[PDB]
Design an enzyme around this catalytic site. Structure first.
Site, short mmCIF file in Angstrom:
data_model
loop_
_atom_site.label_atom_id
_atom_site.label_comp_id
_atom_site.label_asym_id
_atom_site.label_seq_id
_atom_site.Cartn_x
_atom_site.Cartn_y
_atom_site.Cartn_z
N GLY A 181 0.51 -24.78 33.58
CA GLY A 181 1.30 -24.74 32.37
C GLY A 181 2.17 -23.50 32.31
O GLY A 181 1.67 -22.38 32.25
N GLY A 182 3.48 -23.72 32.32
CA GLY A 182 4.40 -22.63 32.55
C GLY A 182 4.26 -22.11 33.96
O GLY A 182 3.76 -22.80 34.85
N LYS A 187 -6.69 -18.41 35.81
CA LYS A 187 -5.26 -18.64 35.64
C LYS A 187 -4.50 -17.66 36.53
O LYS A 187 -4.76 -16.46 36.51
CB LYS A 187 -4.84 -18.48 34.18
CG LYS A 187 -3.37 -18.87 33.87
CD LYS A 187 -3.22 -19.44 32.45
CE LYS A 187 -1.98 -18.93 31.74
NZ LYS A 187 -1.67 -19.76 30.55
N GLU A 227 -13.40 -18.51 30.72
CA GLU A 227 -14.52 -19.44 30.52
C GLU A 227 -14.11 -20.85 30.99
O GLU A 227 -13.01 -21.30 30.72
CB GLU A 227 -14.88 -19.46 29.04
CG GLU A 227 -15.82 -20.54 28.57
CD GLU A 227 -16.00 -20.51 27.04
OE1 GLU A 227 -15.37 -19.66 26.38
OE2 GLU A 227 -16.77 -21.33 26.49
N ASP A 278 1.18 -23.03 19.46
CA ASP A 278 1.39 -24.21 20.26
C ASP A 278 0.11 -25.02 20.38
O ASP A 278 -0.19 -25.57 21.44
CB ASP A 278 1.89 -23.83 21.64
CG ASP A 278 2.28 -25.04 22.45
OD1 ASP A 278 2.58 -26.09 21.83
OD2 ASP A 278 2.28 -24.96 23.70
N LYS A 326 -1.94 -28.00 20.50
CA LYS A 326 -1.66 -29.38 20.92
C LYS A 326 -2.87 -29.89 21.70
O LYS A 326 -3.76 -29.13 22.06
CB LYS A 326 -0.43 -29.42 21.82
CG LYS A 326 -0.66 -28.85 23.22
CD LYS A 326 0.65 -28.37 23.83
CE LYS A 326 0.48 -28.05 25.29
NZ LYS A 326 1.76 -27.59 25.89
N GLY A 329 -3.48 -30.72 24.67
CA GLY A 329 -3.75 -30.22 26.02
C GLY A 329 -4.20 -28.76 26.08
O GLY A 329 -4.62 -28.28 27.14
N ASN A 330 -4.09 -28.07 24.95
CA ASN A 330 -4.60 -26.72 24.80
C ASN A 330 -5.96 -26.73 24.13
O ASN A 330 -6.54 -25.67 23.90
CB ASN A 330 -3.66 -25.89 23.96
CG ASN A 330 -2.50 -25.38 24.74
OD1 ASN A 330 -2.56 -25.31 25.97
ND2 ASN A 330 -1.44 -25.01 24.04
C1 LIG Z 1 -3.20 -30.98 30.27
N1 LIG Z 1 -4.54 -30.87 30.83
C2 LIG Z 1 -5.26 -29.76 30.18
C3 LIG Z 1 -6.72 -29.75 30.66
N2 LIG Z 1 -6.85 -29.98 32.12
C4 LIG Z 1 -8.03 -29.55 32.79
C5 LIG Z 1 -8.51 -30.27 34.01
C6 LIG Z 1 -9.63 -29.87 34.64
C7 LIG Z 1 -10.41 -28.69 34.13
O1 LIG Z 1 -11.62 -28.23 34.76
C8 LIG Z 1 -12.78 -29.13 34.71
F1 LIG Z 1 -12.65 -30.16 35.64
F2 LIG Z 1 -13.91 -28.40 35.03
F3 LIG Z 1 -12.94 -29.66 33.43
C9 LIG Z 1 -9.98 -28.02 33.01
N3 LIG Z 1 -10.73 -26.90 32.53
C10 LIG Z 1 -10.19 -25.65 32.11
N4 LIG Z 1 -11.08 -24.64 31.71
C11 LIG Z 1 -10.64 -23.49 31.31
C12 LIG Z 1 -9.18 -23.24 31.28
C13 LIG Z 1 -8.34 -24.22 31.66
C14 LIG Z 1 -6.84 -24.04 31.64
C15 LIG Z 1 -6.19 -23.07 30.95
C16 LIG Z 1 -4.76 -23.29 31.21
C17 LIG Z 1 -4.60 -24.34 32.02
N5 LIG Z 1 -5.86 -24.85 32.33
C18 LIG Z 1 -6.10 -26.00 33.18
C19 LIG Z 1 -3.26 -24.85 32.49
C20 LIG Z 1 -2.05 -24.14 31.75
N6 LIG Z 1 -2.37 -22.82 31.16
C21 LIG Z 1 -3.61 -22.53 30.70
O2 LIG Z 1 -3.76 -21.65 29.86
N7 LIG Z 1 -8.91 -25.45 32.09
C22 LIG Z 1 -8.74 -28.47 32.33
C23 LIG Z 1 -5.81 -30.68 32.91
C24 LIG Z 1 -4.43 -30.57 32.26
#
Ligand SMILES: CN1CCN(c2ccc(OC(F)(F)F)c(Nc3nccc(-c4cc5c(n4C)CCNC5=O)n3)c2)CC1
Ligand SMILES: CN1CCN(c2ccc(OC(F)(F)F)c(Nc3nccc(-c4cc5c(n4C)CCNC5=O)n3)c2)CC1
Ligand SMILES: [Zn+2]
Ligand SMILES: [Zn+2]
Lengths: 290, 290
Positions: free
Chosen positions: A24-25, A44, A93, A138, A140, A142-143
């Site tokens: 993201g970004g 990240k 986390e 923001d 939403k 997905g956050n």
């Molecule tokens: C739109 N979706 C949002 C959630 N998504 C996602 C897919 C698999 C994941 O691990 C699992 F498998 F263990 F669950 C997680 N788990 C996760 N845990 C902590 C921080 C972030 C994170 C923080 C941030 C991001 N992420 C994925 C991307 C952009 N910037 C961030 O701050 N993501 C998230 C996929 C994309």
């Protein structure tokens, strides 16, 4: 071009670099294991190539500044940062159940009880931030990440801004929030209510199964928001609906504060599960009596 | 993933695929030779992968619709299009001296005579479009290409919109113009004057050596524009300056029309070269008398 291991020369631990998760970004994101205490995190990881400009750099620091000051059950835990020369590494986390976004892709509209459950935790997290003079800006689907017991944790503070003094109106927002509030678009000066607005769209989206202002063109959507053009399907309950109406108002001085939110009859006269079946990840929960 | 040769199954010719040139939006751009009449063109080449959505698709068609209807000396000539399955191929007149942008990178501020010379051709080209109910909507230094005799040719009609009836106010603009006009930002309804505005910034930039509203953050710039916050260095001549002032006004009904532009004393009481030394590409021209 990112190192297999990650070393923190100051707190000293290193991290084995796990699997991709999201992005993201200028950020891409992976899981990562402490390699000694063997513990697991999301990392990240931002390339310093995208950060050549001082304006980008500050944005990134600000986010660390804001996020790192934050501890609370429905906020993604900040566990540190560090950089080499090509990369900024931030340790978060890990939320093993991804985000509300993915759950929505798969269940479209939710049952009311699910909406409350999730929504309540969204508000509790936002009650937290607001009481620390922080606006996410923001919020939403997905956050809104979910850990293992399907608890909500708010994430990505890269448009998060700090309120520096009572009455302040933040005059600009350098980015494109998803569920962006009317007052932001009318380039008019905004504060905490922007998050109440966003939560208003989350609520719609979770109950109705789609975003309150979606259209094929972004600028048309923005038009809709400004003119406050949406409608609430007739099958949504009247109590639910009107909480939406409350939050989705063009004048921020009219939208509930984050703090009086949980009081709304939607919550208090409604059944709110204590926990959710992980089934609920893919099957509508019935909430039977045994 | 783009074919070496390019075939037009309907006009029948094919094109050998030359060197990279530039790119803008979902487009990348190369020179290309007719391979039989051996003639040389620039080919704009868009992957259909970026065009999966109907909204993107229309934008792209619209551009072909607008651009293809256009013939004139200071507009980049449209020589056709066609597609395979992965790509849209558009054939353009080739501008061998790149764009005003590059010339600016290298000469910063220009001599007045150069400014007139170039500016005049910019206006003549815009006089053309405006008389065909077409607004470019993103006139900037990188869309102003120069052919071999250093003549200006306007390019990239991907934010170009057609005026469909007298009085029409286009209510939205799906994109981010460089030199964007005030009325666009105040989401207020806009027409031809947006191009006069842009030309106003071009003029500043060519004379002053930098953009009239530059700041480290885009949203701050937008603020500046809205509040009309700029200043004209004291060394710029008073005639030059005030033409700028004319065009850089927040109320479009006050800015000169494209058509009365060339009349302005800036032009008529000033020396306008007939042609330019290709030297002028890197050395300030002196315009001596022999
Ligand atoms: C739109 N979706 C949002 C959630 N998504 C996602 C897919 C698999 C994941 O691990 C699992 F498998 F263990 F669950 C997680 N788990 C996760 N845990 C902590 C921080 C972030 C994170 C923080 C941030 C991001 N992420 C994925 C991307 C952009 N910037 C961030 O701050 N993501 C998230 C996929 C994309
Ligand atoms: C910002 N700069 C703008 C001008 N640039 C440029 C560099 C080398 C060139 O060929 C040469 F060497 F023969 F002079 C040209 N010549 C050229 N000629 C016709 C159309 C386009 C064009 C039309 C479009 C684009 N291009 C490069 C890119 C984006 N979309 C377009 O519409 N470009 C342009 C480099 C990037
Ligand atoms: Zn659009
Ligand atoms: Zn910015």
């Amino acid at each position: 071009e990112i190192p297999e291991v990650l070393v923190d020369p100051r707190s000293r631990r290193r991290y084995v670099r796990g699997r991709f998760l999201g992005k993201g970004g200028f950020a891409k994101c992976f899981e990562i294991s402490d390699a000694d205490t063997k513990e697991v995190f999301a990392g990240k990881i931002v390339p310093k190539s995208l950060l050549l400009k001082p304006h980008q750099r500050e944005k990134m620091s600000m986010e660390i500044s804001i996020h790192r000051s934050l501890a609370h059950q429905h906020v993604v835990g900040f566990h540190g940062f560090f950089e080499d020369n090509d990369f900024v590494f931030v340790v978060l986390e890990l939320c093993r159940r991804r985000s509300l976004l993915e759950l929505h892709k798969r269940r479209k509209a939710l049952t009311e009880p699910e909406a409350r459950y999730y929504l309540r935790q969204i508000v509790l997290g936002c009650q937290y931030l607001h009481r620390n003079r922080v606006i996410h800006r923001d919020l939403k689907l997905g956050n809104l990440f979910l850990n293992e017991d399907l608890e909500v944790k708010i994430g990505d503070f890269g448009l998060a801004t700090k309120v520096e003094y009572d009455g302040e109106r933040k005059k600009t927002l350098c980015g494109t929030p998803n569920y962006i509030a009317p007052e932001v678009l009318s380039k008019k000066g905004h504060s905490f209510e922007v998050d109440v607005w966003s939560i208003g769209c989350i609520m719609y989206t979770l109950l109705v199964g789609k975003p309150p202002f979606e259209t094929s063109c972004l600028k048309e959507t923005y038009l809709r928001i400004k003119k406050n053009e949406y409608s609430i399907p007739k099958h949504i309950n009247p109590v639910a609906a009107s909480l939406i109406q409350k939050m989705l108002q063009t004048d921020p001085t009219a939208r509930p504060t984050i703090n009086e939110l949980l009081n709304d009859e939607f919550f208090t006269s409604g059944y709110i599960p204590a926990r959710l079946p992980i089934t609920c990840l893919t099957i509508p929960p019935r909430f039977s009596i045994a």
